[PDB]
From a paper:
The [name] crystal contains 1 molecule per asymmetric unit and the visible polypeptide chain begins with Leu184 and ends with Met400, hence 6 amino acids of the C-terminus are not visible. There is one break in the mainchain of [name] at Gln370, suggesting the loop that it is in is flexible. The B subdomain of [name] is similar to that of [name]; however, the extended β-sheet is formed by four antiparallel β-strands and instead of the long β-strand β6 in [name], it contains 2 short β-strands (β6 and β7), which form an antiparallel β-hairpin and are connected via α-helix α5 and an extended solvent exposed loop. In contrast to [name], the regular secondary structure of the P subdomain of [name] is comprised of only three short α-helices (α6, α7 and α8). Similarly to [name] it contains one disulfide bond (Cys341 and Cys354). Similarly angiopoietins 1 and 2 are the closest structural homologs of [name], with rms deviation of 2.7 Å (200 equivalent Cα positions) and 2.6 Å (200 equivalent Cα positions) respectively. However, the β-sheet of the B subdomain is narrower in [name] than that of homologous structures and β-strand β6 is much shorter and turns away from the β-sheet towards the solvent and together with β7, α5 and an extended loop creates a separate solvent exposed element in the structure. For [name] there are two reported mutations (P251T and R371Q) which are linked to increased triglyceride levels. Of the six mutants made in [name], three gave no soluble protein (G223R, W349C and G361S) while one resulted in greatly reduced protein yields (R384W).
Parallel to this two other proteins have emerged – primarily from genetic studies – as being factors that significantly modulate plasma triglyceride levels and CAD. These proteins, human angiopoietin-like protein 3 ([name]; also known as Ang5) and [name] ([name]) are, as the names suggest, related structurally to angiopoietins which are involved in angiogenesis via their interaction with the Tie2 (tyrosine kinase with immunoglobulin and endothelial growth factor homology domain-2) receptor. Here we determined the structures of the fibrinogen-like domains of [name] and [name], structures which offer new insights into reported loss of function mutations, the mechanisms of action of the proteins and open up the possibility of rational design of low molecular weight inhibitors. The fibrinogen-like domains of [name] and [name] form compact structures and, according to fibrinogen nomenclature, can be divided to 3 subdomains A, B and P.
Author numbering: 184 to 369, 371 to 400
Amino acid sequence: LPRDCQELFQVGERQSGLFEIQPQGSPPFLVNCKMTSDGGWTVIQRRHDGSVDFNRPWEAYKAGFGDPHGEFWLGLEKVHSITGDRNSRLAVQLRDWDGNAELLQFSVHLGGEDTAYSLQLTAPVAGQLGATTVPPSGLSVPFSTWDQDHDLRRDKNCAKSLSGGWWFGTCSHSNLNGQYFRSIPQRQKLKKGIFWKTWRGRYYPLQATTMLIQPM
């Protein structure tokens, strides 16, 4: 069995879809691979119609949930079995309600559960994401869900005030795992939506997202 999508690409697999892989120290599981000029990408998240509830607790974000032929979240322990401790490219694809698309890419490291699946960002990459003052040693941002939220403020639970699970560095940078919306609701619920502040705004609900990862 191939270790990951990139191994699949490297033996000549051309089609994007569902394939059986087995990383190190993992049981076999079925991934979504995307085959591109750039090689094999692992699809770790995909949203496009609001048919799958993303407002799930810690254990569901670890194991994964959703339809692998539709909207889904692959699962932090599956993603981390794929990346290991290797530097990885993370691709983030957004789509607004006018058909426009926005393609972003960041090199990251992803810790395991001992780190609560923290994203480890160098200072330049954290600068790319809008952090204006960061130590030269960078930034790690743990994953948070409503039942396991890492906002240090005794008053505030970021995941619980919004929706879904995410790397909430702040509570207003992004959340691609929020509540899916089609049109304008009555502000206090748009807070809880699918958003990426620096593209269409804090309160603009995205039509579609994909996240993909690829080691190195």
